[PDB]
Design an enzyme around this catalytic site. Structure first.
Site, PDB file in Angstrom:
ATOM      1  N   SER A  39       0.813  -1.190   0.000  1.00  0.00           N
ATOM      2  CA  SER A  39       0.000   0.000   0.000  1.00  0.00           C
ATOM      3  C   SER A  39       0.869   1.272   0.000  1.00  0.00           C
ATOM      4  O   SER A  39       0.952   1.960   1.023  1.00  0.00           O
ATOM      5  CB  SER A  39      -1.019   0.021   1.101  1.00  0.00           C
ATOM      6  OG  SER A  39      -0.367  -0.099   2.336  1.00  0.00           O
ATOM      7  N   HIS A 157      -4.972  -5.687  -0.493  1.00  0.00           N
ATOM      8  CA  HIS A 157      -4.185  -6.867  -0.875  1.00  0.00           C
ATOM      9  C   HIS A 157      -4.568  -8.022  -0.034  1.00  0.00           C
ATOM     10  O   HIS A 157      -3.757  -8.924   0.282  1.00  0.00           O
ATOM     11  CB  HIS A 157      -2.690  -6.582  -0.710  1.00  0.00           C
ATOM     12  CG  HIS A 157      -2.205  -5.521  -1.641  1.00  0.00           C
ATOM     13  ND1 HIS A 157      -2.054  -4.208  -1.261  1.00  0.00           N
ATOM     14  CD2 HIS A 157      -1.830  -5.579  -2.942  1.00  0.00           C
ATOM     15  CE1 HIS A 157      -1.665  -3.491  -2.303  1.00  0.00           C
ATOM     16  NE2 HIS A 157      -1.488  -4.303  -3.327  1.00  0.00           N
ATOM     17  N   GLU A 166      -5.194  -2.759   8.826  1.00  0.00           N
ATOM     18  CA  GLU A 166      -4.516  -3.373   9.986  1.00  0.00           C
ATOM     19  C   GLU A 166      -5.254  -3.126  11.288  1.00  0.00           C
ATOM     20  O   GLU A 166      -5.721  -1.991  11.554  1.00  0.00           O
ATOM     21  CB  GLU A 166      -3.109  -2.874  10.185  1.00  0.00           C
ATOM     22  CG  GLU A 166      -2.329  -2.728   8.873  1.00  0.00           C
ATOM     23  CD  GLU A 166      -0.963  -2.093   9.059  1.00  0.00           C
ATOM     24  OE1 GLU A 166      -0.559  -1.733  10.219  1.00  0.00           O
ATOM     25  OE2 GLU A 166      -0.259  -1.865   8.021  1.00  0.00           O
ATOM     26  N   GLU A 209       1.872  -9.909   6.683  1.00  0.00           N
ATOM     27  CA  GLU A 209       2.492  -9.430   7.967  1.00  0.00           C
ATOM     28  C   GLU A 209       2.356 -10.379   9.133  1.00  0.00           C
ATOM     29  O   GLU A 209       2.742  -9.994  10.260  1.00  0.00           O
ATOM     30  CB  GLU A 209       2.071  -8.001   8.360  1.00  0.00           C
ATOM     31  CG  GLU A 209       2.489  -6.972   7.270  1.00  0.00           C
ATOM     32  CD  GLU A 209       2.362  -5.520   7.717  1.00  0.00           C
ATOM     33  OE1 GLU A 209       1.806  -5.225   8.784  1.00  0.00           O
ATOM     34  OE2 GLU A 209       2.844  -4.640   6.975  1.00  0.00           O
ATOM     35  N   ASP A 244      -4.638   0.661  11.297  1.00  0.00           N
ATOM     36  CA  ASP A 244      -4.187   1.355  10.070  1.00  0.00           C
ATOM     37  C   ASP A 244      -5.293   1.183   9.045  1.00  0.00           C
ATOM     38  O   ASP A 244      -5.592   0.076   8.569  1.00  0.00           O
ATOM     39  CB  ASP A 244      -2.854   0.790   9.516  1.00  0.00           C
ATOM     40  CG  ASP A 244      -2.315   1.613   8.286  1.00  0.00           C
ATOM     41  OD1 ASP A 244      -1.160   1.327   7.845  1.00  0.00           O
ATOM     42  OD2 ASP A 244      -2.974   2.603   7.871  1.00  0.00           O
ATOM     43  N   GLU A 292      -4.321   5.129  12.135  1.00  0.00           N
ATOM     44  CA  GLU A 292      -3.408   5.601  11.106  1.00  0.00           C
ATOM     45  C   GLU A 292      -4.121   5.710   9.734  1.00  0.00           C
ATOM     46  O   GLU A 292      -4.998   4.880   9.382  1.00  0.00           O
ATOM     47  CB  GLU A 292      -2.251   4.608  10.997  1.00  0.00           C
ATOM     48  CG  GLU A 292      -1.224   4.907   9.892  1.00  0.00           C
ATOM     49  CD  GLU A 292      -0.213   3.745   9.684  1.00  0.00           C
ATOM     50  OE1 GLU A 292       0.334   3.567   8.564  1.00  0.00           O
ATOM     51  OE2 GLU A 292       0.035   3.008  10.629  1.00  0.00           O
ATOM     52  N   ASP A 317       0.753   8.430   7.663  1.00  0.00           N
ATOM     53  CA  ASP A 317       1.641   7.495   6.939  1.00  0.00           C
ATOM     54  C   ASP A 317       1.729   7.931   5.442  1.00  0.00           C
ATOM     55  O   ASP A 317       2.691   8.577   5.024  1.00  0.00           O
ATOM     56  CB  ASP A 317       1.125   6.058   7.112  1.00  0.00           C
ATOM     57  CG  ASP A 317       1.872   5.050   6.223  1.00  0.00           C
ATOM     58  OD1 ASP A 317       1.336   3.888   6.001  1.00  0.00           O
ATOM     59  OD2 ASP A 317       3.021   5.365   5.839  1.00  0.00           O
ATOM     60  N   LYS A 342       9.185   5.705   8.051  1.00  0.00           N
ATOM     61  CA  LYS A 342       9.562   4.638   7.112  1.00  0.00           C
ATOM     62  C   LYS A 342      10.767   5.148   6.394  1.00  0.00           C
ATOM     63  O   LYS A 342      10.610   6.036   5.549  1.00  0.00           O
ATOM     64  CB  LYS A 342       8.426   4.308   6.144  1.00  0.00           C
ATOM     65  CG  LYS A 342       7.298   3.467   6.773  1.00  0.00           C
ATOM     66  CD  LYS A 342       6.140   3.350   5.871  1.00  0.00           C
ATOM     67  CE  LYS A 342       5.140   2.270   6.298  1.00  0.00           C
ATOM     68  NZ  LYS A 342       3.844   2.315   5.545  1.00  0.00           N
ATOM     69  N   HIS A 370       8.003  -0.942   9.803  1.00  0.00           N
ATOM     70  CA  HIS A 370       8.413  -1.849   8.723  1.00  0.00           C
ATOM     71  C   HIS A 370       7.629  -1.475   7.436  1.00  0.00           C
ATOM     72  O   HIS A 370       6.786  -0.531   7.410  1.00  0.00           O
ATOM     73  CB  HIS A 370       8.094  -3.318   9.092  1.00  0.00           C
ATOM     74  CG  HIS A 370       6.619  -3.606   9.322  1.00  0.00           C
ATOM     75  ND1 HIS A 370       6.132  -4.893   9.354  1.00  0.00           N
ATOM     76  CD2 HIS A 370       5.545  -2.801   9.547  1.00  0.00           C
ATOM     77  CE1 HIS A 370       4.835  -4.873   9.609  1.00  0.00           C
ATOM     78  NE2 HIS A 370       4.438  -3.610   9.676  1.00  0.00           N
ATOM     79  N   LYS A 393       5.745  -0.430  14.980  1.00  0.00           N
ATOM     80  CA  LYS A 393       5.037  -1.509  14.388  1.00  0.00           C
ATOM     81  C   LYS A 393       5.920  -2.264  13.390  1.00  0.00           C
ATOM     82  O   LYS A 393       6.513  -1.663  12.502  1.00  0.00           O
ATOM     83  CB  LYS A 393       3.683  -1.088  13.778  1.00  0.00           C
ATOM     84  CG  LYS A 393       3.740  -0.325  12.447  1.00  0.00           C
ATOM     85  CD  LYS A 393       2.330  -0.003  11.910  1.00  0.00           C
ATOM     86  CE  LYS A 393       2.368   0.218  10.373  1.00  0.00           C
ATOM     87  NZ  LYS A 393       0.995   0.515   9.825  1.00  0.00           N
TER      88      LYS A 393
HETATM   89 MG   LIG Z   1       0.921   1.558   3.006  1.00  0.00          MG
HETATM   90 MG   LIG Z   2       0.157   2.532   6.851  1.00  0.00          MG
END
Ligand SMILES: [Mg+2]
Ligand SMILES: [Mg+2]
Ligand SMILES: O=C(O)[C@@H](CO)OP(=O)(O)O
Ligand SMILES: [Mg+2]
Ligand SMILES: [Mg+2]
Lengths: 432, 433
Positions: A39, A157, A166, A209, A244, A292, A317, A342, A370, A393
């Site tokens: 994503s 996905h 998430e 994940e 998320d 998020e 994010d 990130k 991650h 995370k």
């Molecule tokens: Mg993403």
């Molecule tokens: Mg995210």
């Protein structure tokens, strides 16, 4: 000085090629690898893929490897700059690329080198990597983060229909980082059986994940499962929930589609304000302490409205892409109050550190992160300690591209001995 | 010699505690971790667990850690032996435990130290780990194995009805190891889409070893999916198929249950003979070239019957348990013609190397193996190259407890250079190259 740089193509946790860099100094070999998102926000630095449709389904990184080997490598060596000089070395690489988004070399090319440099630097400073990063960031204290475990995996996905990406558990009430790992793992294994009992064995396989994608629509039902597992495990007083949403993934024509993983249907779309109201219900009805990417990366109005009407952590994010330019805008507009950090969204250690600092100067939290395609690399475990951000995370406690980071954090904790503090309930603002 | 040892609990790829050892010498810090099975044979060396139900649902490994820290560690410092002395050091632990199946300290305690010793020993020699191993085992001419990717998960490794455990692809026709990773990965991606197309996106989550876990019952349908993905990726002439049935997992009052994860119903049970016929059908209908644990670990006559009536590789895993006593019985009785080599089924590096050599001396293949539960450790990559076995199975090309090994195999190939030889079609027998 740098003696040799040599890049190659390894495979990430989903089986796709990515960049790994070996850097040699008089102190020896230092190795690093680059993660890759699914994503990915539109504003992330460029990830350079080969696009040879016949080789690795167009996902090769032969070109990024060649830019390091043929171009970056000899420039950096020729400079004679010491590996302690992270900012100098990162900046030379940025100038050599000459593009704002790292599109000449790829952000993956530059980052692999940046990471390997940082590890070499540590050694040349005769410090562990988390202490080297601390000094690079001007921090004189250290703290172990509360880990956020993505236990119900979802999204664009998703081996499944759930819209939001998430559903994380955070053992804010744990006694130490090693104890937080216990609480996370125990709740994970308890959740497996709650899912099996309700949905059958077929639903107990894992996502990218390492969490589960039982076959559900309602995001409330994911929260209810997580809440049950936490209670069945006996940790209701000690574990809370972060989400998320990855809302840029289901943004459609100015609105939001809570089923975009189905075949198209304009009629199922809702407004930002409807989306916002749903999240208020989640915060009232579940122990949700952090959300998020609640809206799209461009829907600034929705972010600033939402954030002003809640007391929870709101994490940028895709909004922020670890990028000081976007962070400034988000700070001015009060869009969010926590940055997701990130390294590969920006492409150098130096810039991610600058982004962390900027958020922190401005009263934000920072959660190190991650990517959904990870490697055996464990850089981000030292980075979160070194940056003292209090929260990380890096997956379910399942799949060792996740556990390699969690186990490294346990090692850093043991290493700090007496000196170890654990963010716990102050995960949002550990600096106290 | 050994300066200090320190063991700790870490988490394995399923989120279960396991043993990690740090061992220090004047060269520095050497670290290894121990893996853990799910479909574990009854004859494996003892994996010591704490049994405290208020900690990791019984699965802690604090007892093994303390064995290492308080008792094994001073024994080996006291010995004064160089870490290059793998055999002497292992023997000191085997004698100090003093039980046949390592039930005093746990095979996991012993093995965690054994592996760290071996890493430290390689550094003391100033050699890469694969070369140090080579010297321990008496080899010189190293080879890169064919990898065996477990791309569809069943049995005890997956939430699905599918009873057989592992459906593998082997790129025997690849040009190099780096090339076999590209073949494996392309078939795996292609397979994702064959599965998504036929069964739904919800059928493409993964099992414990990174293979897809589609919601199918029929083992033949798993083979059909793999064969389709192979052909669709354009590699029919270059990739063949291997299985690990893990039959001990579904052996029931003398028969076998191919729907064992479904509520018990003995009406559906079949005989050894019926299972064997199925394997014949799979061999004739699919490019199956290796079949692991086709029968229960104690069902010796079934093994011996089957093996004598096929021309393919037949691998002992639970049958043999990387144990020279069981391997010897297997050899005499012609029960199989390949050894699955698992360091933690026997408990020490030295014993695993002896097991390998025993097998290779008897004309068998050896396939180096991970466990269900793996860690970030990559020792088995150096091991399979040092032992020159020609074949390794260490997961689908998915989940980095598997990729860490595959990636390390690529780096070893890089290191060997024009000295690198890939086993290819000689995976069973690479001494010939
Ligand atoms: Mg993403
Ligand atoms: Mg995210
Ligand atoms: O049966 C096996 O061959 C192994 C390896 O995949 O599985 P486990 O480690 O669970 O025994
Ligand atoms: Mg088994
Ligand atoms: Mg087996």
């Amino acid at each position: 000085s740098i003696e040799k740089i040599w890049a190659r193509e390894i495979l990430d946790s989903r089986g796709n090629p990515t960049v790994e860099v070996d850097l040699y100094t008089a102190k020896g070999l230092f190795r690093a690898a680059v993660p890759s998102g699914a994503s990915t926000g539109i504003y992330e630095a460029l990830e350079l893929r080969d696009g040879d449709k016949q080789r690795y389904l167009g996902k090769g990184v032969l070109k990024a490897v060649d830019h390091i080997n043929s171009t970056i490598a000899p420039a950096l060596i020729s400079s004679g700059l010491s590996v302690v000089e992270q900012e100098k070395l990162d900046n030379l690489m940025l100038e050599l690329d000459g593009t704002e988004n790292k599109s000449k070399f790829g952000a993956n090319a530059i980052l692999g080198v940046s990471l390997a440099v940082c590890k070499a630097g540590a050694a040349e400073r005769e410090l562990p990597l988390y202490r080297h990063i601390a000094q690079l960031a001007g921090n004189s204290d250290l703290i172990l983060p509360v880990p956020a475990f993505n236990v119900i995996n979802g999204g664009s996905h998703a081996g499944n229909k759930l819209a939001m990406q998430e559903f994380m558990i955070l053992p804010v009430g744990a006694e130490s980082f090693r104890d937080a790992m216990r609480l996370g793992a125990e709740v994970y294994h308890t959740l497996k059986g709650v899912i099996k009992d309700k949905y059958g064995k077929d639903a107990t396989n894992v996502g990218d994940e390492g969490g589960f994608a039982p076959n559900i629509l309602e995001n409330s039902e994911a929260l209810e499962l997580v809440k049950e597992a936490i209670d069945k495990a006996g940790y209701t007083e000690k574990i809370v929930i972060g989400m998320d949403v990855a809302a840029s993934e289901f943004y459609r024509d100015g609105k939001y589609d809570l089923d975009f993983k189905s075949p198209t249907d304009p009629s199922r779309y809702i407004t930002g304000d409807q989306l916002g109201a749903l999240y208020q219900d989640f915060v009232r009805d579940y122990p949700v302490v952090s959300i998020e990417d609640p809206f799209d990366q461009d829907d600034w109005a929705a972010w600033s409205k939402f954030t002003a009407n809640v007391g929870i952590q709101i994490v940028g994010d895709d909004l922020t892409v670890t990028n000081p330019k976007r962070i400034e805008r988000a700070v001015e507009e009060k869009a969010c109050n926590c940055l997701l950090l990130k390294v590969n969204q920006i492409g150098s250690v130096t810039e991610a550190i600058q982004a962390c600092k900027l958020a922190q100067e401005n009263g934000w939290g920072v959660m190190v992160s991650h990517r959904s395609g990870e490697t055996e690399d464990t850089f981000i475990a030292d980075l979160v300690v070194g940056l003292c951000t209090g929260q990380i995370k890096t997956g379910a406690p399942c799949r060792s591209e996740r556990l390699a980071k969690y186990n490294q954090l346990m090692r850093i904790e043991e290493e700090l001995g007496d000196e170890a503090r654990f963010a716990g309930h102050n995960f949002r603002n550990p600096s106290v």
